[PDB]
Amino acid sequence: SGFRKMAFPSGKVEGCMVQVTCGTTTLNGLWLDDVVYCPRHVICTSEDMLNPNYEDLLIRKSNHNFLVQAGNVQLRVIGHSMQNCVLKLKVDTANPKTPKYKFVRIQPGQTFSVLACYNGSPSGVYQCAMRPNFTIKGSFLNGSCGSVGFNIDYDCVSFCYMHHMELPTGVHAGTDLEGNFYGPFVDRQTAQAAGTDTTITVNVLAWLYAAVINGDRWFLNRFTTTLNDFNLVAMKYNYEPLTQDHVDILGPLSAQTGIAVLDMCASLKELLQNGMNGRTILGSALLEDEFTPFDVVRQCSGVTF
Amino acid sequence: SGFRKMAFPSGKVEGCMVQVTCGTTTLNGLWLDDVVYCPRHVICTSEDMLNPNYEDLLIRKSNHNFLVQAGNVQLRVIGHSMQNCVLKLKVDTANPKTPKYKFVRIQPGQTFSVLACYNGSPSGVYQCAMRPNFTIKGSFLNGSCGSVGFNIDYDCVSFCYMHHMELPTGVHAGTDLEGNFYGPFVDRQTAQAAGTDTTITVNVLAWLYAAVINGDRWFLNRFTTTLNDFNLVAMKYNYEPLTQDHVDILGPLSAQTGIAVLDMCASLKELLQNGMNGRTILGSALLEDEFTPFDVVRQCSGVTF
């Protein structure tokens, strides 16, 4: 019993974190085999960020301008290249702790673990979701750039996020490990903002199934709805549309609890229209949307890595 | 910016998790140097749990009755002893991944990270607090016994909890690493139930200071309170008494934000009276009590927004 915001064990990722220094800037890098991946904005100065022609700034750098430190050991950079917004520093030592890994790009609504690092040293791990507006509600201070997000499947780490910036509302933006930003953001100093966000409906439903599995059933009712009526109500409350794919993905949770997905939608509609009336669900007074159906199945089944 | 329930990176603890099997029972063990620590109830049947005589059950066991598996390698048990409610299995191999560590017994209100494991394999990591009633609100399924709680301030792991059981309300009970239970709980199937729990006042105040540091002041008021008047009100909401020790511990957060502890107490009194009126504090509609003053200082910026 119990339901916590649970992150993947971070050991396989901790063994990849390094410190990258270029000029006065220090940030984090991800060392996999003989390459260290980091935000390309490490080549930038305070002025350079205003109009950064990253090809022009990079051509002026030599390999020895990049100082890479892994624990108490300096790695030597023997090559450098840029892939989208990530800088790839070729080093003369392959990381002996390189886990089995893949670079994956995730979709909004999908969750991942973040290993927040400072000066190449892991500080903490937390779970978060890629918001529908492509930001993440992270917890990051200055020096956290280059911290990565990941999931684990069996023995393979799927790296899905690298931290680049904090937006004016305090939320965060970054790229996949191929350096493609999530969302309409750029690594240049210009006016940027998080767009209006929405609630991840399929995740709220997954969390309501988690509450039922844990014995919290007060919100259940005899009613069902159709997908179209539910989506008309979801649009009204800034909830993401629920698709037949979401209904299919919630199938196993529906079979386990005996509550059809549209039956749970009628519960969600009533919660949106009437509130919780002084009650909580899984210790929360708000509808939680940062657990996917897979996270719920995994936490209520004890999957290991 | 941001404020998340952040766990310590779990790598140093992952490298210590092993599987312990005795008869048909399989649970987790913590392998540090040449000793594997695990709940002594690994030697019990379900019928033994009503009134187990651990000394009598243990004397009947030989070293080779304990099967210890670390990854795909069987460790050989060369000795065994019981210390309170923990069994210490001496093995013929020292764990090469043993981190710098200490065994620490914590007090109610203290937080720690839990690395939930099954079959000696880590499944996830989350943050927990030792409740005032000495239980933890964990997320644990059958087979999670022997999973540990810890803190990693610096590069030293302070192990503070070993999981033993789930109580009837779905909350959890366990011991320190010397095998002393937290609370009045016993590793015996008795009618023991979690006592009435209370809110960890000093932690709620720390979290209100975190909210001020992150840029929110809506909940502040022009009032102050004496410590005694605050405690008289707080106890009416099932909040723990706030002691002069708690006031002293909140000193640094008070100095950073410019809000006197007793002025923050006045704000908490008003939040208890009024509720949040549709507002949130650090993304929560409830007053959060699982961040200590130390956690807030660790996670938050040293410069108030």
Ligand SMILES: CO[C@@]1(C(=O)Nc2cncc3ccccc23)CCOc2cc(Cl)c(Cl)cc21
């Ligand atoms: C060089 O990093 C910057 C940054 O956002 N860093 C941060 C990232 N996370 C948490 C932060 C907490 C507080 C302070 C900065 C944080 C500084 C501000 O200007 C910019 C501008 C751009 Cl386009 C980019 Cl890609 C990065 C940065």
Ligand SMILES: CO[C@@]1(C(=O)Nc2cncc3ccccc23)CCOc2cc(Cl)c(Cl)cc21
């Ligand atoms: C042998 O472990 C037990 C247990 O609590 N296990 C569990 C621990 N965590 C989460 C659980 C989730 C669901 C089912 C069991 C869980 C089984 C029940 O009876 C008892 C009774 C006692 Cl006095 C003790 Cl010390 C252990 C156990």
Ligand SMILES: [Cl-]
């Ligand atoms: Cl303590």
